[PDB]
Amino acid sequence: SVSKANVPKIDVSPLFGDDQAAKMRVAQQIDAASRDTGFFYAVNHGINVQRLSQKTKEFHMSITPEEKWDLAIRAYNKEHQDQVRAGYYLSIPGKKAVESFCYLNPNFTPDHPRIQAKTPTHEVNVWPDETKHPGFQDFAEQYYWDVFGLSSALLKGYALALGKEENFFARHFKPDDTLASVVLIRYPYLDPYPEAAIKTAADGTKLSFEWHEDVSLITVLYQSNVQNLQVETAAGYQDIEADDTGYLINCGSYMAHLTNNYYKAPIHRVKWVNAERQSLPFFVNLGYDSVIDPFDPREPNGKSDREPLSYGDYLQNGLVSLINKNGQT
Ligand SMILES: C=C(S)[C@H](NC(=O)CCC[C@H](N)C(=O)O)C(=O)O[C@@H](C(=O)O)[C@H](C)CO
Ligand SMILES: [Fe+2]
Q1: What totals of helices (H) and strands (E) does the chain contain, helices first?
Q2: Which class in CATH covers the domain with range 1-329?
Q3: Are 310 and 175 a contacting pair, CB within 8 Å?
Q4: Distance of CA 271 from the midpoint of ligand 1 (Å)
């Protein structure tokens, strides 16, 4: 069998308050988890994940093929050249099982300075018709802000963990310009399940998505209660237990860059499971021009031989590379 990965449950509630000592004790837990498998579950996070799941299910199960084309990103619909990131990512029956809906910062409106400039990675969200999906847009926008708030708190914990002041990351994570995204992923139950939609790892494990590091600062993930994720450790790939009451947290490769691999971006993959389930990541991205000077918390002078990299540069190049490596989702 595959061994269970160590994924501690960390009560992150102190990170919302003003008890600095208590925050330090949470930071230590984040440090330990980040230095070990690179994953932890944030518990006592304050978000109503059951309602998120319910609203997401109502959306996935009621949206029609017509609407999917009308909301599709450019990869599926040549008419929508502005939709690189935001919109619907279609399944391909008999070939590709997964489908999803991505949205960005609700503040990226037509008048936003980065939208006017047509800066890469900024787009205006697309939404289904309100009469067909009543309350969905409002719910989804509010969810963005709810998970932004959790993520800000988590970023205070990571900053303290690394020996910095608590706003070290969060000062670059701002409502007016964050490049963060929500993805509402549907993994279907299918009978029969098309072999073409199943990948096979070198070790023989059936997969829905191959090994990768995340393109993010951190990733803040809600998943249904169906085990599927695996993390590569020195002991090999290990199973990450499901917990549909908590958020699964890990670092992306921007964190690895900034910390000179002190907090690695864990390599992980998604096992194929024939189950109707949800995977709802929030990718914690900074602003387009955000640059944090790389450092090394294992070195006495804290200096690193990595060059500063703007977040916008990192993101545009990472999203493309991901598609090249593991395919268009
Ligand atoms: C490889 C990853 S981390 C997938 N992410 C992407 O494909 C990038 C989406 C970026 C988005 N379109 C944007 O524009 O921001 C992803 O979301 O995987 C989730 C899953 O497959 O369950 C789960 C997180 C498994 O790792
Ligand atoms: Fe991932």
Answers
A1: 7, 13
A2: mainly beta
A3: no
A4: 14
